[PDB]
Each structure stands twice: as C-alpha cells, then as structure tokens.
C-alpha cells in the first residue's frame, strides 16, 4: 500500500558515522562513495547547526554515479523536522505566474517556523447522552462518559449540543472533545457495546477504552514555512491556493511584513526559525534569468541551503549562446562549492546489486551475480538493476525458485542495453527517421 519498491527505496540515511565523520563503507544503503559522502556529512552537520546562510553546494558528477542517492540519504537523515524540498528544475517554467516568482516561492517553502502551544482534550467512552429536545430545542443535556479510571457527568451548552447532534455521538463512541474549539473526532467504537450497533458493516473495527485520566493537556508542535504564511495572507480564504496552485504574483510588501513579524516573534520568544534544505535537481535546466536571481536570493538571513546536481560538461547556458562548465555561468560558479563524484569499482557494483537484490527479495546464485556484475561493468547500474526485476519474473515464468544464468541471459537477450540500442540505430539508418528519409524495404 503506497510503498511500492522504487529506485531509491533501499536508502535509509546517509550511512556515515556521526562522531568522527568516517564514511563506513556499507551502512544504511549508501555503499562505496567515500569522499562525496564525507563532504555531504559536513554539509549535513552544518545544516542542523543553523548558524550559516543559504549557501550552495553543487553535486557534480557523471550519470548514474549516485547523486540523487546522496540527496535522498540527506533527506532520510533529517526526519520530519527540518524541511527538505525537492525541486526538479522544470516546475519553475509555469504559466499561472512568472518564473522568478515561482523560484522565490520555492525559496520561501524551506524556512520553517516552529511554534509549540497547548490544547486541552478529553478521551473516553460515552456511557450515555440525554438531550432535552422536548416543541423544544437544543437547550440542555447531560453527558455521562468514562475512561478505564475516571467517570464523569457534564452539562452542555447550546453550541455543544449543536455539535453533539452534528457528529451524532452514540452511547459507546470513543470521542475527543477538543475543549477550546468544540470539534469531535470519534477515534473509534468501544468493543463492549458491540451488540448496540446495528447500522454498521459486518466487518467493523472496535477499540478499547482509553487508559489514564480524562482531561489532559497536549503540547503539539507545529512547523509551517514562510510560503505558507504568504499564501494564507493573500486572499480572503487563500490557503486553498497552496493546495490548488491558483496563487498568482504575491505582492512583495506582504513578504516584507511577514519577514518583519517572524523576527518580532523570534525576539519575543514566541517562535523559532528552522532553516531547511532546497534540492534543485538538474540545475542545468535553468536559464541565466534564474541564476541572476539565485545569486541574490542566497544573500539574505532567511535563505535555505541549496543543494544541486549537474550532469553536463562544457555545455551551453539556456537563454544565451555561450558555453560554460556544468551548464552554469561563472559568476554563479563563484558562489557554489562543488563536490565531484567518481565511477564505481566492480566490487562496489556487485554489492550495490546485492543491496538492490535484497531490497526486492529476489534470490540469486553467485554465478548469476557474477554475470550481472559483468553486465553492469559494461552497461551501467540502471540496466542491471532492471535486469534483476526482469530476471525474477522470468524465473517465475517456468516455476523456479532462484534466478540463474539461464534467466539473466534471457533478460539480456530481450531488453537491450543502450549501447546496443545506439548500435541498432547506427546499423538501421535508412528506415529509422533520422531527419528526412523513410525507406520501406
């Protein structure tokens, strides 16, 4: 259920030590890359510090050398505390709004405000409800509830009886009367009144009575970004915009006033600022109009740390015509700090394929693993990592248990690696449409 095995469902953190920053070679999924993972550990430990601006670290390297892997490791090694925001750099070129403002919203989404305030809630099974609607109305009524320990009677206001017939609280429900507002979230049904429920399904879950006292205070901790507050303070009822994207050009005085009130909340001790992480995946897909704004959005106090990944070598910059390293302008490459990765040695290829095999729970003979490492030496990680999933199913065709050489050699036979596909294009020129000609036999 919504945990289908993706291409990065085996990474459970960055995997490095947190005491001497040593990249131990096989832990939490990330296996083999040493120097880049130590530099990512240093960057990760200066994100959680908070006493640095929005800086820019560029994960440069060849294709399929573990850059999104390092980014997903840093995403998993923070939890749901410091806001990590992914950004493939083609979500910016929108039509609902401009392009620089679409970039500004992605900067504002990664600066959380974390505030902690209390509520007063009530657990418990309702023993019975009596409502004096006799022509009468919702005027007075009695509510007898209990936990395993407590038991109590309350009298109800009119704007609570109008909330009891709103949720239809029965005799046996497990409700949570939030006292400061009045909403009722029925946590379930009590088991002991299983006879007393007729208009339910045949298969219906039942809980037990809540344990402990019946009137307790919760210290809930909320964390919302500055883009949240910007979209909330933009219309009459405007938070729906951040669930439907219908926000437009937000005027800059609203963002300036919210940048003032967050500082006034911090100095009064009512709030706390958490700088997040913004991962601009495929940063070479930005034109120079983006870099002339990222060069100045990484200057203010309220700026998240930007981590970004580039594949291209000496390539052209979009918008302009002149080439540059990594597809980035040089006045912006002065800002960034570059981590270079390396291709993988064959034993590291073998154990990455071993981790990808143990993630999908596919049994492999060591001869088939040697053949698969031999394929991955010549066709990359993605092809062999797909041959695993293909070979399990081909072994399941003929009712086998373990995959072998006779199934990896079928998966290598049917599904071409891209080198043989380029050879197929080069040796089938006259029928494939190059630019002009179609020849039919």
């Amino acid at each position: 259920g919504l945990n289908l095995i993706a291409a990065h469902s085996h990474i459970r953190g960055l995997g490095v030590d947190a005491d001497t920053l040593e990249p131990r070679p096989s832990s939490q999924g990330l296996v083999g890359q040493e120097k880049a993972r130590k530099a990512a550990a240093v960057v990760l430990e200066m994100i959680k510090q908070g006493k640095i601006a929005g800086r820019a670290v560029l994960i440069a390297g060849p294709p399929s050398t573990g850059k999104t892997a390092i980014a997903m490791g840093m995403a998993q090694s923070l939890g749901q505390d410091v806001p990590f925001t992914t950004l493939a750099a083609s979500e910016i070129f929108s039509l609902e709004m401009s392009k620089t403002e679409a970039l500004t919203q992605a900067f504002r989404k990664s600066i959380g405000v974390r505030i902690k305030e209390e509520s007063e809630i009530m657990e418990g099974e309702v023993v019975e409800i009596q409502i004096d609607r006799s022509t009468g109305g919702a005027k007075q009524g009695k509510l007898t509830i209990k936990t395993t320990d407590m038991e109590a009677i309350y009298d109800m206001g009119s704007k609570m009886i109008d909330a009891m017939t709103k949720e239809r609280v029965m005799a046996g429900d497990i409700i949570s009367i939030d006292k400061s507002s009045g909403k009722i979230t029925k946590l379930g049904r009590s088991y002991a009144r299983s006879r007393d429920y007729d208009a339910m399904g045949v298969d219906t879950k039942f809980l037990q009575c809540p344990e402990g006292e019946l009137q307790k205070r919760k210290e809930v901790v909320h964390t919302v970004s500055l883009h949240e507050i910007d979209v909330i303070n933009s219309r009459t009822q405007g938070f729906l915009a951040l669930f439907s994207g219908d926000t437009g050009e937000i005027r800059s005085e609203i963002r300036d006033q919210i940048n003032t009130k967050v500082a006034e909340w911090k100095e009064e001790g009512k709030a706390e600022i958490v700088p997040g992480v913004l991962f601009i995946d495929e940063v070479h897909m930005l034109d120079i109009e983006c870099f002339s704004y990222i060069n100045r959005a990484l200057e203010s106090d309220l700026a998240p740390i930007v981590i970004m990944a580039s594949n291209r070598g000496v390539s052209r910059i979009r918008g302009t015509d002149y080439k540059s390293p990594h597809g980035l302008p040089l006045d912006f490459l002065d800002r960034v700090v570059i981590i270079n990765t390396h291709p993988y040695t064959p034993d590291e290829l073998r154990q990455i394929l071993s981790i990808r095999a143990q993630e999908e729970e596919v049994d492999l003979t060591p001869d088939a693993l040697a053949l698969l490492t031999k394929i991955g030496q010549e066709a990359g990680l993605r092809y062999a990592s797909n041959l695993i999933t293909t070979s399990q199913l081909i072994a399941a065709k003929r009712r086998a248990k373990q995959v072998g050489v006779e199934d990896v050699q079928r998966s290598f036979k049917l599904f071409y690696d891209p080198a043989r596909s380029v050879r197929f294009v080069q040796e089938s020129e006259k029928r494939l449409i190059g630019n002009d000609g179609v020849v039919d036999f």
Partner: protein, 449 residues
C-alpha cells in the same frame, strides 16, 4: 461495429511458458518484441513496480502501437491504461509538467467500498422555522425545518440545518415530491410527484413514481473505481457540500489548475488511511506515451523526479526516430530523441521490419477482419505492393477494391479491381515523383515551392 486500423489485434498470443508463437491472436511473427511485452505485462500484474521505463524502438510501420493495444487488451478492463501522445501535453492553462503528473495519476487506480446513507421518503409537511435576526443588513434567515418523510413502512419527522434547507430549496421540493436526502454531502435529488397525487389531467410532464418501499433511513454499500487524479480534481476544485465555495465553484467555468505537491502528498496519506482500514485496494497501471520524441528536454528532465516517487506507474514510450535532435536544446543529438541521461532508465525493446510472407499473412488477416474476401493472385498482388511500396499502404488498397468490385457485380476481389484501384488511389512516392517531374517551373500550371 467499425473496423478501425487496430481491430484484428486481440492480444499478444503467448504460450503457457511465455514463448511467442507466431501467427496467433492477430500478430504475425515479431517474436522478440512480443515476448518482451509479455514480460512487461507480468511486471504490471505483480505490483512490485514503482516506475519502470520501457521503450519501443523501431521504424514507422513496424507495429509499435499494435503492441500497445495488445498490452491494453492483455491487462484487462479493471487495470488503468492511459494512452497519450507527445504533443498532447503542450497546454495553455498549466505548465506541461502539470499535464505529465495528471497523466501519471490518471494511470493509478483505486477500488473503494462506500456506505451511502440515504433518506428516501415522500415529503409530507414542509414548514420553515426562522430564528432571531437583528439589524445586520441581510434580514431574516431560515434556520430550522420540520420536514416529514413518509416511506412505505414507518414515517419519520426530521429537522434540518440551513444548508440542507438550501439544498432542498435549489431543487424546488413541494409537498408530495419524493426525495432522498444524501447525508454524505447534503445533496437531495427530487425524483417526482408521488402516485397518491397522480392525475392524468396534467401538464408539467412530471415523472410519477410510487412510494419507496422499506425503511425511510436506508443504508447501502457500493463499490467505486476512482483514480488518484479524480481525488486530486475533487479536492482541488470543490463541488460537494452545501456551502458557498462548493456552490459558486460549479457555476464558474472549469479550468485546469496546477495541483501542487502538498495536495498530491496529502491525498497519498488519505489513500493509505483507506488501505489501512481494509476498504480500498490499490491497482497501478500504465502510462503509454506514444511519440515520445515530440517531448522536449524540459519533460525528460521532469520524468526523472516523476519516476523517483515511491508510487508511480510504469511508462511505455514509443519513438520512431534514429539519430535526431532533441526538441528543447538544439545542440545535442542523440538516439531516438531521448536524451542520453534519461535513456539509461529505459528497458529498450527493438522492433524489426517484416518479410515478404509476413506481409501476405497480415494482408490475409486484415482482409478476413474487414470482410473483404478475395483470390490468391490478388493477395500476391497486394503483397507485391507491400514489398515494393510500404506496409500500411497495401492494407489501404482493400477498401476501394471492395467497392469497385461491388461496382462490377462481383463478390470476391480479382486482379482487375486492384489494378484499377492502384491507378485511382496513389501512394506518396509516385505522387512525389509526379510532383518533381510535372512541377518543373512555378507559374500557372505549377506548384507553389
């Protein structure tokens, strides 16, 4: 009952051991593509898939989309299959990555049980009961009702909110109208005058239905097939309930909007809450992007993050291009139009051209599919045109050659009818030859160059 271009295809025609047997269930030959498509189909029907790339290479006229209809008829009806093109996503309301994600979440299905709570009655006494209304401009407001519903076995006399009264009021429910109040939204569709007030001397053309039998407070469970994009559109533009946002939001014109990341994650958590209650079943599907070389580089950049998701359907790309230039940046050439970075995700399936006997078998299958019977010399003539000219040109010389046959009182198509239809209806190559030869100079009897 219309023979389209793809009607004889009824599946891949595979054995029990997954080996493609040629000339079975519509196809002719094409072994190494249909076995790989069978592997893709059993990859779909095993649910260990969270984004896999399957490319269908091969020149035009070799059956790339015949394999796609074979897959879509091999999976079944109850598995989602979204076929699009590469030119369809260039919209004018939203960015094209929004159209990509809307197709990705069209290609994921969900089967949910629901328990509707209808109040199915005949309205007996309808009387409003307004509340106090001091000086605030708008004046009085109706706040409480006493609507009495009367079913066949046991009546009921119930009390309503203002909003459910407005749901009644925008339906024009008089005394005598049977309704059923849907207490999930609040909606209430009038069905008609009850048959106790029936009169044949009538003019309103009302639909007289009898009193609904059973209890007035029914409760019924149904099964629904809802994709995740349906939930995205439902939570994006609200059209359920009886408030003002969900009522003035169905009078406006509907616009495709940009459903953001937060709604697409919150609906994922809501669906996981459905699955943990033992109610809904998830069934992922296929996004078939035909003509993938029309996508520019800003789409192959975003397909990486669209496939890195923990829930993502399998993508089947079709691209009939050789070494070509990518649409986005015109300075890097690559195979198929696919960029050289995105191409490594793909499990590339080739597709090879045909043979002078496989063309004869395809012509025979297409002739017995459309309903045109003919002689073997005519089959050899059409196969000769298939070898010389094209594959999907010689198939189209069967539809005039039937009609001309019916001109000459015949039933079967002989050599003369195809020898006349090859002269009335021309191909592209001889038309370009006539174009180059006759169109020597521009002028009165020339062509605009």
């Amino acid at each position: 009952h219309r023979t389209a271009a793809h009607t004889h295809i009824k599946g891949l025609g595979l054995n029990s051991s997954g080996i493609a047997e040629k000339q079975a269930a519509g196809f002719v030959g094409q072994c190494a593509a249909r076995e790989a498509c069978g592997v893709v189909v059993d990859l779909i029907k095993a649910h260990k898939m969270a984004g896999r790339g399957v490319l269908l290479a091969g020149g035009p006229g070799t059956g790339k989309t015949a394999l796609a209809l074979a897959i879509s008829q091999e999976l079944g009806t109850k598995i989602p299959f979204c076929p699009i093109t590469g030119s369809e996503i260039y919209s004018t309301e939203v960015k094209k990555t929004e159209v990509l994600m809307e197709n990705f979440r069209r290609a994921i299905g969900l089967r949910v049980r629901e328990t509707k709570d209808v109040y199915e009655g005949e309205v007996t006494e309808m009387t409003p009961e307004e509340a106090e209304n001091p000086l605030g401009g708008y004046g009085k407001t109706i706040s409480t009702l006493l609507i009495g519903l009367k079913s066949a076995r046991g009546q009921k006399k119930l009390r309503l909110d203002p909003s459910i009264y407005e749901a009644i009021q925008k339906e024009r429910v008089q005394v005598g109208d049977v309704i059923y109040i849907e207490t999930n939204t609040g909606a209430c569709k009038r069905v008609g005058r009850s048959d106790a007030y029936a009169t044949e001397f009538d003019l309103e053309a009302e639909e007289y239905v009898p009193i609904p039998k059973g209890e007035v407070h029914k409760k019924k469970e149904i099964v629904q097939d809802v994709t995740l994009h349906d939930l995205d559109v439902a939570n994006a533009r609200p059209q359920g309930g009886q408030d003002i946002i969900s009522m003035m939001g169905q009078l406006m014109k509907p616009k495709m909007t940009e459903i953001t990341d937060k709604l697409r994650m919150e609906i994922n958590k809501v669906v996981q809450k459905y699955i943990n209650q033992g109610v809904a079943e998830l069934i992922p599907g296929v996004l078939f992007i035909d003509e993938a070389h029309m996508l520019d580089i800003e789409c192959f950049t975003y397909l990486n993050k669209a496939l890195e998701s923990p829930i993502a359907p399998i993508v089947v790309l079709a691209s009939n291009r050789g070494i070509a230039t990518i649409r986005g940046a015109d300075d890097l050439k690559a195979a198929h139009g696919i960029p050289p970075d995105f191409l490594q995700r793909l499990l590339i399936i080739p597709t090879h051209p045909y043979e002078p006997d496989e063309i004869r078998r395809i012509v025979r299958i297409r002739a017995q599919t459309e309903g045109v019977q003919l002689t073997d010399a005519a089959v050899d003539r059409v196969a000769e045109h298939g070898v010389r000219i094209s594959l999907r040109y010689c198939l189209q010389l069967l539809a005039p050659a039937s009609i001309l046959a019916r001109v000459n009182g015949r039933t079967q198509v002989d050599v003369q009818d195809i020898a006349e239809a090859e002269e009335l209806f021309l191909d592209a190559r001889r038309s370009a030859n006539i174009l180059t030869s006759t169109g020597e100079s521009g002028g009165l009897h020339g062509f605009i160059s």
